[PDB]
Thaumatin-1 (Thaumatococcus daniellii), 207 residues
Amino acid sequence: ATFEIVNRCSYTVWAAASKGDAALDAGGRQLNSGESWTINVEPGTKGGKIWARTDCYFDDSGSGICKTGDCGGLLRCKRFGRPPTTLAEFSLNQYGKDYIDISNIKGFNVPMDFSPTTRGCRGVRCAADIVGQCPAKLKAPGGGCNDACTVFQTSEYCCTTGKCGPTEYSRFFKRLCPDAFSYVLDKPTTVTCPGSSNYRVTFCPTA
């Protein structure tokens, strides 16, 4: 499947794509403002994620650092990035269907629209100014709005027991973005699409 990743932000981002133990396609690339990068993701990919990284510096071998979503200092991500990261999440060809969502469980850095380019389902979006409105105690000095699990490392915020409820912090993410996961056990906002759909991830979609 094809994922067109489009940076509509006014600033450069470094897109990343991984399923956690491996890159998807090249795994990462610079996207200047307005650039589109089209990747191929293998059918059957389970637990795949795409995200933006901000304020990155890489050497001529692809090694360096980002202020948000750094994946072990690599241009080409092989693993998930360091929070805060708004997450486009997807599992493909899972018994005949694809499942997509956006998640704020690992915080928020960049606004995002995650939509099929082919027929038969809707897109998901979290494009409110979460950074600007972020609760003081969640603000990341590196940039972005952290999730409460990352900041406080409790069983309640991290849902470590599989028993956890919504929180003051999760409610903030949910108020700003109803259509994304605000905590691990949030009422699912996952969208069922046809198996083998194609997609576009658009960073800063509101323009």
About this structure: DSSP finds four helices and 13 strands in the chain. The domain at 1-207 is CATH 2.60.110.10 (Thaumatin).
